[PDB]
Amino acid sequence: GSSHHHHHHSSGLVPRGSHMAKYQVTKTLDVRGEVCPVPDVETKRALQNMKPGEILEVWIDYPMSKERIPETVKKLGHEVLEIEEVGPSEWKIYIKVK
């Protein structure tokens, strides 16, 4: 994947924070060019089995947070940390299980 050696990436506090902020994200959920109904059951596990202080990403053409709200609100409220856009119907959302 991305792990090959020791952690020597984000060592010192670099102020080179470009457009995209280097937040403490854990996983990323991408449902762009989907095929089989596998990705569907995937997101289901996200809300069905949310972890305490988890942080996930969302890259699609629709706000998945729609179902996220009912879940996080059942316990706390919402996993809202960041929201942005990219193109016409393609947007990017940031979610974080508190």
Side-chain angles (χ1 to χ4, degrees):
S2 247
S3 196
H4 213 42
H5 259 99
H6 294 65
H7 281 52
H8 43 32
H9 324 95
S10 235
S11 0
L13 238 298
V14 285
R16 283 182 114 126
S18 253
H19 264 231
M20 259 59 121
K22 289 264 144 112
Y23 262 71
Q24 240 119 39
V25 186
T26 339
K27 238 238 182 87
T28 303
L29 199 75
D30 35 78
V31 216
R32 326 156 292 161
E34 75 159 285
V35 241
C36 26
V38 192
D40 238 78
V41 197
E42 185 160 312
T43 194
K44 265 266 221 198
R45 188 92 113 271
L47 310 327
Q48 138 161 10
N49 176 249
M50 327 125 296
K51 228 153 273 94
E54 260 290 85
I55 311 100
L56 258 55
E57 186 178 297
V58 188
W59 219 76
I60 16 169
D61 79 287
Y62 63 103
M64 201 81 100
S65 90
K66 52 127 92 120
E67 264 123 11
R68 268 85 180 290
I69 303 148
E71 266 69 272
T72 353
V73 74
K74 188 107 160 78
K75 308 119 70 79
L76 31 133
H78 20 63
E79 9 205 60
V80 44
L81 80 107
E82 159 137 290
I83 306 107
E84 54 219 309
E85 69 226 52
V86 202
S89 11
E90 37 222 33
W91 305 311
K92 175 180 219 196
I93 316 96
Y94 272 67
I95 230 72
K96 155 249 227 273
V97 203
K98 287 244 197 177

